[PDB]
Amino acid sequence: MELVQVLRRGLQQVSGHGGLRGYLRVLFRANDVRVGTLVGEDKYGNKYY
Amino acid sequence: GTSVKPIFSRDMNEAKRRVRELYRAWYREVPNTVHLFQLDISVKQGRDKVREMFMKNAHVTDPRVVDLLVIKGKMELEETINVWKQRTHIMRFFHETEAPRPTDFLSKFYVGHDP
Amino acid sequence: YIRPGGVHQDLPLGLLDDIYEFSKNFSFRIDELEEMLTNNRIWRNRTVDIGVVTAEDALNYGFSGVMLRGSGIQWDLRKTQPYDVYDQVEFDVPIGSRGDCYDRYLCRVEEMRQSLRIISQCLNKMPPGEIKVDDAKVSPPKRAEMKTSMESLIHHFKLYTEGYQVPPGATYTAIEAPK
Amino acid sequence: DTRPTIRPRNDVVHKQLSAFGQYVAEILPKYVQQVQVSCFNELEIFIHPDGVIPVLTFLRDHTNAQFKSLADLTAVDVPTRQNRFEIVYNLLSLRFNSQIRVKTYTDELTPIESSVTVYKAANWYEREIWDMFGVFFANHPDLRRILTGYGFEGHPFRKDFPLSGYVELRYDDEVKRVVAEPVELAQEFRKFDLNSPWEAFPAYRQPPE
Amino acid sequence: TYKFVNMREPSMDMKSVTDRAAQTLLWTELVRGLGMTLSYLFREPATINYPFEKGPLSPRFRGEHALRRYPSGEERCIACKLCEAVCPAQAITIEAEPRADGSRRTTRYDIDMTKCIYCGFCQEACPVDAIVEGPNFEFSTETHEELLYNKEKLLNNGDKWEAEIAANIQADYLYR
Amino acid sequence: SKVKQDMPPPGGYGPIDYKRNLPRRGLSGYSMFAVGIGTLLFGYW
Amino acid sequence: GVRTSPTGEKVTHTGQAYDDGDYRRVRFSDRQKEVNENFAIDLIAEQPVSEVGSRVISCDGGGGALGHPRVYINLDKETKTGTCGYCGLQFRQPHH
Amino acid sequence: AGLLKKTTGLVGLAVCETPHERLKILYTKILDVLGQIPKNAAYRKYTEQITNEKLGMVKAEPDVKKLEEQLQGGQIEEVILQAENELSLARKMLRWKPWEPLVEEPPANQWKWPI
Amino acid sequence: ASATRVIQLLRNWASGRDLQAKLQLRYQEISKRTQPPPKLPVGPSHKLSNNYYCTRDGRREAMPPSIVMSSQEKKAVTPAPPIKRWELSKDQPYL
Ligand code: SF4
Ligand code: SF4
Ligand SMILES: [Zn+2]
């Protein structure tokens, strides 16, 4: 059951990262696929989590 | 005041005695030093140079100063043969990288305001 | 940080708490090392009975700290000559009885634990008060006092340009640095 | 302490050291010229230059001294003294938890017979006193340079020696070797004269001379 | 007080020696090393994803220096000249002149990043807290000349990091 | 205002363990050899 | 503000200006000369002149602890608006 | 006395199984060599004071375990080592003979810090 | 922390100890990085009553070394009492 939840969380990462495109984008641009709440944004496009 | 301690030598005779074999040793070492250290200078250059630093201080009178500087001059020949120094440490004695400093009065006057 | 006359600044609020959390978990990390190395044959055989020295040669050679305590020499600066507040705290000096490489290793890891003892005691007995001496001639005045009082400004000026003049003399002070 | 600002003093150790100061003095009225116990419970035994072995062997093996820990040996180059160098031994007693300081005056040429026999710790602790200062130590196993560069010239800790020295290195592409040249700095040392013209603490003032 | 660290009394009963023989023959203690290191294999790493996340710092951090200025805009530095006097590396070099207004400030505040020590004495030096170290530490470069700073470069950095250091000294000046 | 500076909690921080906590685990030496021999005769059989 | 030299060479508040030849300017090309566009002199001059009716006025400069060492500049010279040395703010007093 | 302690806790220094009489015969020896140095000597008076006095109970009290606090100088097995050191000193300063006045008064004011 | 229970038993069993009690990294336990402003104490001699520097002169109260014997029936003493053999550890004497 625990492994099922972890797999569920893994799929939620893809959904959180705007589907497939964002998930592949962040993985090949930041080596991170962990998603957190939006916290702010400067006048530059720098997404902050 | 005049009476003082002979760190190794009573008289300049035994002081000049000390400089002799060290001079003999320094002249024997030249062919092997240049060989293993892999230099480009000639054996005679070492000999006539080993000549050189023996003379600029060949004017002292206190037998302590000469014989203390004897152990000073003692203190590189072994530092060479046991390859302790580098190539840069004995071409340093062959000061060559610099321009030849000015000798006539006019040349110093031309270079700058420094005697 | 450690300046003549005390310390330069005071700790940020709550710093004692975070270091306390580290102190609780650190003893586990020491156990981690001892599990890893202490009983391992390969480590011992590369370390035990290696580089042994007698007590007399170790002392005559000018050695200090673990180099003596590993060889069984009964000596430690914090205990014999307690500087600062080291007298108002107890700690078990880990004296070995072989003098080889292994004895010093166990001597160090116990000194790790005994160091952790000092953290615990000073943490539960941290007194209030100022961080530097109350003498502007050797301690720069507080920034707030700097910008309102003349004598603070003069003393701050002369301390940061000329500095305090130390009375003449000589002194060889000694502390047990972990080396 | 009623006055927490000033450091408390320990008088009990003060005369106890003073008692031991006279103690060693009476054994060797030939060597011990001066004994001094400072304010901070530090005792100093001023000895003659040829006393490096005797008094140290005394302090090392005595029943009431047992000072077998050689802390350090240092020189204090004082130009204004006819004996510029001042070799200073520091001794520590495990049994009596005390410290011993002995100083010997010495000129440049005048040698000091090595104390290696007394303490073998001094073996390495002379190879730099010859390096930094230039005081030669007699009957010593080796006097090799271990701080100055290989073939470096001079004794840097001497106060006639500049802080920047004389030689500066640089790799030279002409000869494929780093070579030395006379030192020229990007910026010179902006020395500061911080000795205030108004007198300091009057206790240590020199008498009218 | 003190304690021994190597006094081992291996009991010579038939029990303990069997354990000792078991230890040597079957590499029990070595297996502990395997099981010990295996334990952290199955544990999370603590590897910060730089530069997507940095290390934790404190308001007292000392980094790239930056000369600040008052809320009005006038520079804080007043030819105080204390900063280089207390600077233990002599990186600061400052020369003042008369100024047209009479608020005679300096023309030069060259501090060599390859000479300074990030001592912390700089802010403690000038009473008007003119020069402070900004929290920046990524001011790396490729030519040695750029590390040599000058009065324009510091003042520009002061105008850059002004948003940060102002809050840093805001939450730390009580300690100072 | 009253003096506020970093101080321990009024009861002090909790106790900090400092012993060596090396775990006494594993089987007895005879059991090690017993099973070690035990799996053997299974293999030959 | 900031001015422009004959070679462009945006002058600094100090007044540094490389000459026509001035071979040292070769380090400037292919790069940029760092200039602080904000000049100290003309960002304090336009600041409003404070009107405080007293002979002696403290000049801590805002945030006494965080400002500059407080001065007690005199305000009696009616010709010249008395200003703090550290602050540079020009304090004037209305008609004594 | 009692059971012979296995180790002294100081590597290199071993346990002597007959310590009391070794300490005895040492203490007489330093008393013996102290016969040579004349009576007026202060070093003689100092160690003729702590030898016989410390030879007292080691002659009387035979228990080395109690001898630890009789001498307050740690373990007996290194007390005899220290006693040997005192014997070495007696041999050494039988040459030194420091009872003469100073060899030299200190040249002018070489002392008197500060300068 | 993230780590599921089955992993935790594997880590706990392999290391022979429980690790969820204390971990190498940090978590919410740390103090927040926006601690309230402090109110640092004043000096012991900060009083505006009698506080003359004539009392505390640590630098000035120093004295040049005391002259005891200069070149220009007895007892035997030691520079300090001989050290005291400290006892074994009460918590754990034999490690
Ligand atoms: S930066 Fe500070 S110390 Fe330096 S001159 Fe300016 S005010 Fe003085
Ligand atoms: S940068 Fe560091 S070394 Fe340089 S002046 Fe400032 S504090 Fe001193
Ligand atoms: Zn002002």
* CB-based burial, C44-76: b 16+ in 10 Å, e otherwise: beebbeeebbbbbebbbbbbbbbbbbbbbbbbb
Q: What is the radius of gyration, based on Cα positions, of chain I?
A: 31
- Could you tell me if I2 lies within 8 Å of chain D, comparing CB atoms? no
Q: Amino acid identity of G23? A: Y
Q: D143 vs B75: CB contact, 8 Å cut-off?
A: yes
- I24/C25 CB distance under 8 A: yes
> What are the residues whose beta carbon lies below 5 Å from ligand 3 (ion)?
G 59, 61, 84, 86-87
Q: What are phi and psi of D101, to 5 degrees?
A: -125, 125
Q: Which ligand 2 atom is nearest residue E83's CA?
A: 5
Contact predicate D173/D115, CB 8 Å: no
- Dist CA D134 CA E75 (whole Å): 52
Dihedral angle, C-alpha I3, I8, I14, I16, nearest 10 °: 130
Query: Which residues 37-66 in chain C show a CB within 8 A of chain F?
Result: 38-39
Give the integer Cα–Cα distance in Å for E6 and C104.
Answer: 10
The rounded distance, in Å, linking the Cα atoms of I8 and E106 is 64
Residue contacts between E and G (CB atoms, under 8 Å)? 67
Q: Which residues of B touch D177 (CB under 8 A)?
A: 87-88, 91
Beta strands in chain I (DSSP E): 66-70
Ligand lying nearest the CA atom of residue E72 = 3
Contacts of D46 (CB under 8 A, 6+ apart): D32, D33, D34, D35, D36, D102, D103, H106, H111
H89 φ, ψ to 5°? -65, -40
Residue B73, H or E segment = helix B63-81
- Say yes or no for a CB contact (<8 Å) between D190 and E85: no
> Are the beta carbons of D119 and C75 separated by less than 8 Å?
no
List residues in chain C touching D: CB distance below 8 A: 57, 59-62, 73-75, 80-81, 133-135, 158, 161-163, 165, 167-172, 174
Whether residue E87 has its Cβ less than 6 Å from ligand 2: yes
Let me know if D154 is exposed, middle or buried by CB neighbors in 10 A (0-12, 13-18, 19+).
middle
Q: Which two tokens stand for residue D90?
A: 């520091």
Dihedral sign computed on CA atoms, order C71, C72, C75, C79: positive
- The experimental method is cryo-EM
Comparing alpha-carbon positions, the chain I residue that sits nearest to F20 is I95
Q: Bin C65: left if φ > 0, else alpha if -120 < ψ < 50, else beta.
A: left
C10 contacts: CB under 8 Å, gap ≥ 6: C131, E175, F5, F6, I38, I40
Burial F1-37 (b: 16+ CB within 10 A, else e): eeeebbeeeeeebeebbbebeeeeeeeebeebbeeee
Tokens 């980094």 belong to E63
Cα–Cα dist H42/D208, whole Å: 39
Supply φ then ψ for residue C127, to 5 degrees: -80, 160
Q: What pairing do the DSSP bridges indicate for beta strands G91-92 and G50-51?
A: parallel
Write out the residues of chain I at the interface with chain C, using a CB-CB cutoff of 8 A.
15-17, 19, 22-24, 26, 29-32, 35-36, 38, 40-46, 56, 58-59, 62, 64-65, 83, 85-86, 89, 91-92, 95
Q: Residue D67: name the closest of D90, D40, D88 by CA.
A: D90
**Taking the CB of residue E77, how many other CB atoms lie within 10 A of it?**
26
| Separation of alpha carbons C62 and H39, rounded Å | 37
Instruction: Collect all residues of chain D within an 8 Å Cβ-Cβ radius of residue H104.
Output: 48
CA angle at I55 for the pair I54 and I56, rounded to the nearest 5°: 100
**Cβ(B96)–Cβ(D172) below 8 Å:** no
What DSSP element (H or E) covers E67? strand E65-67
Distance CA D104, CA C62 (A): 20
B69 close to B54: Cβ distance less than 8 angstroms? no
- The tally of CA atoms less than 13 A away on the side-chain side of residue D191 is 5
Question: I82, exposed or middle or buried, with CB in 10 Å at 0-12, 13-18, 19+?
Answer: middle
Neighbouring CB atoms inside 10 A of A19's CB total: 10
One-letter amino acid of D30: K
Residue D147 Cα, ligand 2 centroid: separation in angstroms? 28
Binary contact (D26, I67; C-beta < 8 A): no
Angstrom distance (rounded) from CA H70 to CA H74: 10
Cα–Cα distances in angstroms (integers) from residue D120 to residues C65, D123, D132, in the given order: 18, 6, 20
Side chain identity, residue I24: Q
CB of G80 closer than 8 Å to CB of G90: no
Paired with D178 in beta bridges are D171
Residues of I with CB under 8 A from a CB of F: 15-17, 36-41, 92, 95
> What is the amino acid identity at position G34?
E
Q: Output the furthest CA–CA distance in chain A (Å, rounded).
A: 44
SS3 E69: strand
Q: Say which of H73, H102, H105 has its CB closest to residue I82.
A: H73
Tell me how far apart the alpha carbons of residues H3 and H1 are, in angstroms, rounded to a whole number. 7
Dig out the tokens for B78 from the structure. 């072994």
Q: Give the residue extent of every domain in chain B.
A: 1-115
Listed residue (E175, E61, E84) closest to E130, CA to CA: E84
Q: Is the peptide bond preceding residue B115 cis, with omega within 30 degrees of 0?
A: no
Alpha carbon I7 to chain centroid, angstroms:
40
Full 3-state SS string of chain D:
CCCCCCCCCCHHHHHHHHHHHHHHHHHCCCCEEEEEECCCCCEEEEECHHHHHHHHHHHHHCCCCCCCEEEEEECCCCCCCCCCEEEEEEEECCCCCCEEEEEEEECCCCCEECCCCCCCCHHHHHCCHHHHHCCCEECCCCCCCCCCCCCCCCCCCCCCCCCCCCEEEEEECCCCEEEEEECCCCCCCCCCCCCCCCCCCCCCCCCCC
Nearest by Cα to B40 from D174, D173, D175:
D175
Helix (H, G, I), strand (E, B) or coil at E93: strand
Pair of tokens at residue D105: 């005056």
